[PDB]
Scaffold this active site. Structure first.
Site, PDB file in Angstrom:
ATOM      1  N   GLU A  23       1.133   3.823  -3.299  1.00  0.00           N
ATOM      2  CA  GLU A  23       0.808   5.245  -3.259  1.00  0.00           C
ATOM      3  C   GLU A  23       1.985   6.088  -3.730  1.00  0.00           C
ATOM      4  OE1 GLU A  23      -1.780   6.767  -3.075  1.00  0.00           O
ATOM      5  OE2 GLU A  23      -1.208   8.849  -2.675  1.00  0.00           O
TER       6      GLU A  23
ATOM      7  N   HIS B 191       0.826  -1.205   0.000  1.00  0.00           N
ATOM      8  CA  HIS B 191       0.000   0.000   0.000  1.00  0.00           C
ATOM      9  C   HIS B 191       0.862   1.256   0.000  1.00  0.00           C
ATOM     10  CE1 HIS B 191      -3.379  -2.520   0.254  1.00  0.00           C
ATOM     11  NE2 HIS B 191      -3.459  -2.655   1.565  1.00  0.00           N
TER      12      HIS B 191
ATOM     13  N   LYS C 211       2.466   5.847  -7.534  1.00  0.00           N
ATOM     14  CA  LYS C 211       1.462   6.619  -8.260  1.00  0.00           C
ATOM     15  C   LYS C 211       1.815   8.101  -8.287  1.00  0.00           C
ATOM     16  CE  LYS C 211      -2.073   4.912  -5.979  1.00  0.00           C
ATOM     17  NZ  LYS C 211      -3.469   4.729  -5.487  1.00  0.00           N
ATOM     18  N   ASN C 212       2.289   8.640  -7.161  1.00  0.00           N
ATOM     19  CA  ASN C 212       2.682  10.046  -7.126  1.00  0.00           C
ATOM     20  C   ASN C 212       3.937  10.284  -7.956  1.00  0.00           C
ATOM     21  OD1 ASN C 212       0.989  11.762  -5.010  1.00  0.00           O
ATOM     22  ND2 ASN C 212       1.196   9.691  -4.174  1.00  0.00           N
TER      23      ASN C 212
HETATM   24  O1  LIG Z   1       6.283  15.394  -7.202  1.00  0.00           O
HETATM   25  C1  LIG Z   1       6.090  14.517  -6.375  1.00  0.00           C
HETATM   26  C2  LIG Z   1       5.201  14.603  -5.126  1.00  0.00           C
HETATM   27  C3  LIG Z   1       5.370  13.239  -4.525  1.00  0.00           C
HETATM   28  C4  LIG Z   1       4.818  12.696  -3.380  1.00  0.00           C
HETATM   29  C5  LIG Z   1       5.153  11.375  -3.053  1.00  0.00           C
HETATM   30  C6  LIG Z   1       6.027  10.627  -3.868  1.00  0.00           C
HETATM   31  C7  LIG Z   1       6.581  11.186  -5.024  1.00  0.00           C
HETATM   32  C8  LIG Z   1       6.233  12.487  -5.323  1.00  0.00           C
HETATM   33  N1  LIG Z   1       6.650  13.245  -6.405  1.00  0.00           N
END
Ligand SMILES: O=C1Cc2ccccc2N1
Ligand SMILES: O=C1Cc2ccccc2N1
Ligand SMILES: [Cl-]
Ligand SMILES: [Cl-]
Lengths: 340, 340
Positions: free
Chosen positions: A231, A227, A234-235
């Site tokens: 997440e 999980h 994906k970001n």
């Molecule tokens: O620009 C981004 C914002 C973020 C949050 C979490 C993981 C990767 C990333 N990259």
């Protein structure tokens, strides 16, 4: 009714945090089902009542909302369902078979609590505003509420999975971290390819300090690890793709898995343009992450549930590092339950 | 005397935080000396009195120590030295020449406050213990005390340097960050070579997002930047060398300078074996960093003084990243003074 009487009673008890070892001992044999029943029929009311008591201590503007009342109704019903077994006999295999069936019902009853509590945050923002003091109080409560919810579901999953009639329930004593990384990436890749028609590649590097080139294994809950990594992927993919739309190079996402004497650390590095520090500090806020979402704040709770953490460090104009801190040793992996 | 009367008076005023622009405007011409005098003869008593009032609000076990009383005596004398000029006339060039001489004396009087306040922390640890509540109260006070001290010395340095009879005092409107990085490295290298007979090499990479391959410049106080980078280099080199004593490879220290629309970020990456998360969170504590030191906590204050930050993220078994967050724009670079 007696629900207020039962909350006050079990509220006086403190939750009993368990260690990875204790979890493995409970799941050592199917014969253990009796000890798990006698422990859970007391521990689950204690954890339910403790958070149910804090819910009732919320201000009336929050306590009178349909979301909090709906969830409070689920908890009251779950508490009552478990209290029916207090007098029953562990030696009767029907008493145990009914408990297992009662836990699955309780679990499914609370399946839609995260989005329900997310609707409450949105209602609050539009009914009373998004001030910083409301952020800290909502953050404080939800962190403790969700962490409690994670702990309870963990207990339920360990009993229903093991006493169903290599893996100890949801726990993998030989969890290969890189394999979970790959799985989480492959899922994020599929979604990224479907939505953006392009996905960054994956690179993994392991650093087993004490035993170089030996694959890094640990005792952990792979579903929780998935999980968090899902997440973050994906970001990192969203940022990597959207920040290079006008470019051809799609930089890869690099993941380092490091194993030390105390920490097992997983860093995810992307070059998705980065984020100003001002905004990074708001990605873990439920209220600021709510809009007409909670992946990161909940992911951090999964990391903290066993004495870990999840931290973000970005460099605006370049990329972002995300690090999952876990305890390397099962002896140091102990439940982090809210302090009531 | 009237020292208690003067503290209470100027304590009612709030410090006036200045921006990089306001600092450049004060230093625009030597003719400005009058406006700087009229501003400083009111602002310096206000900032001195505000922190002097918080000192008097410390518990008597801390307030009665010889360290706090010695420093409080310096502040009382400095306050009185500045209050002599309140009635004097700015148009008299002797009034201004005496003010400049009075500021240099005040600055040198407080030259040994950091080690003196460090002796107090050690005395406290051995007289009353090193509990967490004492850590938070000492941390809270010293962070605000040192930040105040940085702000006051900044004001004094800007007046004495500019009105002495390209660079605006301590401010470089075209500060090349990579050059300060190199300077701080070269100094840490010299010390590292002298002590360990070996030093890691340096690698620098710039990421000017909006203007690729254009050197990254900013408006900043290079001395403050040097101090932060020098402390980080000393730690990164110590760890890199001591962690590879039994090896031949001495991994380099890599520094990325990234310039975004809002942040100018400087990351220092080493492979000095890393640090468990449990200890990283204690490297910024004055009490836990005290032993029979404050480079990192003070370095973070320098970063915060102009709305920046300094953060550490390690990976036990591999290495450590340190990131200085600065504001890229002089408009966003404003004094962060303690909130009284
Ligand atoms: O620009 C981004 C914002 C973020 C949050 C979490 C993981 C990767 C990333 N990259
Ligand atoms: O091992 C370490 C600890 C540390 C602090 C600050 C900068 C670099 C490093 N490296
Ligand atoms: Cl729930
Ligand atoms: Cl001082």
């Amino acid at each position: 009714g007696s629900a207020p009487k039962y909350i006050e009673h079990f509220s006086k008890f403190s939750p009993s945090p368990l260690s990875m070892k204790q979890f493995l001992d409970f799941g050592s044999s199917n014969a253990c089902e009796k000890t798990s029943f006698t422990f859970l029929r007391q521990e689950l009311p204690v954890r339910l009542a403790n958070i149910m008591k804090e819910i009732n201590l919320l201000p009336d503007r929050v306590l009178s909302t349909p979301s909090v009342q709906l969830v409070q109704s689920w908890y009251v019903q779950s508490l009552l369902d478990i209290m029916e077994f207090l007098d029953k006999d562990p030696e009767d295999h029907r008493t145990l078979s009914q408990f297992t069936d009662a836990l699955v019902t309780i679990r499914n009853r609370h399946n839609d609590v995260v989005p329900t509590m997310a609707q409450g945050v949105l209602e609050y923002k539009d009914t009373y505003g998004d001030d910083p003091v409301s952020n800290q109080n909502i953050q404080y409560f939800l962190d403790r509420f969700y962490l409690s919810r994670i702990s309870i579901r963990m207990l339920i999953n360990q009993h229903t999975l093991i006493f169903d009639g290599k893996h100890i329930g949801s726990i993998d004593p030989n969890c290969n971290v890189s394999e979970v990384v790959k799985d989480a990436y492959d899922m994020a890749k599929l979604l990224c390819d479907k939505y953006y028609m392009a996905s960054p590649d994956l690179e993994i590097q392991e650093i087993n300090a004490a035993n170089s080139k030996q694959p890094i294994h640990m005792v952990y809950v792979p579903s929780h690890l998935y999980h968090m990594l899902f997440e973050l992927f994906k970001n990192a993919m969203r940022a990597t793709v959207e920040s290079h739309e006008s470019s051809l190079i799609l930089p890869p996402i690099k993941v380092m898995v490091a194993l030390g004497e105390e920490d097992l650390s997983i860093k995810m590095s992307d070059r998705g343009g980065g984020v100003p520090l001002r905004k990074i500090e708001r990605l873990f806020s439920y209220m600021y992450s709510t809009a007409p979402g909670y992946g990161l704040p909940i992911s951090r709770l999964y990391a903290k549930y066993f004495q870990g953490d999840l931290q973000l460090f970005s460099m605006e104009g370049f990329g972002t590092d995300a690090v999952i801190y876990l305890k390397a040793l099962s002896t140091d992996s102990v439940e982090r339950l809210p302090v009531y």
